[PDB]
């Protein structure tokens, strides 16, 4: 019999009003006998029906895969609304049901500090700009780097680490050629989190 | 004597209601002799006071460098209000002033097309996904790439090029390992411009 998996919107979709977040219900392992599959979507227990379901597609193990996609209102998701997908298909005895929702917990607003590179580090070819993001809950967060215009490639972020007061912190490290840092170029760490004003803050840093 | 330069907001900052746009006034070639510099900000003729001046930072020239940022309203900038920085130094015969505004001109809407890699490029271990953005005005624009919610590394973008019909176009090229493309991953080019509905559009691309 089939399998269903239920995928949440990615955080930055929920946090920007410009972008458009979606919940995705996918069923796989549906037999060739009865390829037809019905989706029922509930938001907080009431049926909704603006979901786009796409045409079924056969995979190379000779079973179909079909996906149903529901656009969510940003505020609905951020207010902890439960999204439930219910799949019916003739091979199942009882229809099967998944539910997801934003991670629970009292939200906490992160502080965002930028740390210039250590002086022992500027004897080197590349240098590291550091962004400390601490005090935030829940752990859904986005951290990015920009420079006088366009995004930066060469950065890595730590996974959220549980701190001693129950909130998370993390660090983001951006490595730049030292000649760019020495020229007074400005680099910005932007953070997106549901607990910030406007879900967005930015801290700049330069020599 | 002291030079004056005045930089506009970052396009992304003006197009997103959650980000926060600033006009920046930089003064360089500041002498030790008469070190104090006072700024005076004017929106559409009338004076303003919420500017933030960061204290002087001396350079390797032994010149000084003084900056003052003014936060602007998104709508004020998009509606063409003129921002004027007037700077006084007791080593200037007359205070010196500059003025910026959004690029004048009727706004045209960009068409966004995504172009897969050439069949000839599948010989290499990396391939180029292409994003063509054409028919837009003014040239203040932001292009970014992403995949499964996260910002995609590489990609470079051309400057806007004046088309024959009065508008601009640009291309953005993203380099992915060929295996990532052949697997079926979905990449997406997102674009931000005044003339787009919601100032934002996304176009996807995948094998
Ligand atoms: C003393 O040292 C300082 C420090 O310089 C720094 O250290 C030295 C050792 C070197 O490493 C330098 O490379 C390094 O910058 C010197 O201060 C510099 O002084 C020069 C000239 O005096 C200035 O040049 C101007 O640069 C701007 C662009 O500058 C931006 O881009 C740089 C990126 O490479 C960046 O380093 C700058 O900081 C600045 O970055 C912007 O910053 C803001 C806020 O921080 C940010 O929000 C922006 O996003 C960011 N932008 C970018 C793109 O990064 C340039 O625009 C100027 O061009 C005008 O003048 C040119 C010559 O005339 C000409 O080519 C242009 O067309 C333009 O001409 C003017 O055009 C307009 C119309 O469009 C009109 O208003 C004018 O009439 C017209 N003409 C004139 C005459 O104005 C210009 O090239 C540096 O910015 C400045 N450095 C800094 C950090 O501010 C200083 O010169 C030294 N003193 C000496 C040697 O005696
Ligand atoms: C027949 O083929 C199909 C299609 O596959 C294709 O053909 C085969 C032959 C191969 O060649 C494939 O390579 C080829 O692609 C098979 O379909 C697959 O079926 C398996 C399960 O049978 C599914 O596994 C699940 O995977 C999800 C995560 O999947 C995401 O990430 C993948 C990359 O790693 C990506 O390929 C997927 O498409 C999917 O991508 C997401 O897509 C959404 C929507 O488009 C998008 O928004 C997201 O951005 C994107 N996400 C990412 C990360 O890219 C995984 O979550 C599941 O894990 C559960 O089960 C594990 C085992 O128990 C467990 O360890 C996990 O924790 C999790 O367990 C559950 O978790 C919670 C609590 O922990 C709770 O719900 C449950 O209690 C718990 N337990 C259980 C049991 O559920 C899961 O592993 C594949 O996704 C699916 N592939 C596709 C493309 O749909 C099919 O299986 C084949 N049939 C056979 C062999 O008989
Ligand atoms: Cl990037």
TrEMBL record, chains A, B:
Binding-site residues for Zn(2+) 2, renumbered to this chain: 74, 199
Domain Ig-like, first and last residues per copy: 2-101, 110-206
Residues of the full protein shown: 263 to 469 of 473
Localization per record: Cell membrane
Residues given in the record as Zn(2+) 3 binding sites: 82
Disulphide bonds in the chain: 25-85, 131-189
Organism: Homo sapiens
Gene name tied to this protein: DKFZp686C11235
Name of the protein described by the UniProt record: Uncharacterized protein DKFZp686C11235
Superkingdom of origin organism: Eukaryota
Residues binding Zn(2+) 1, per UniProt: 32
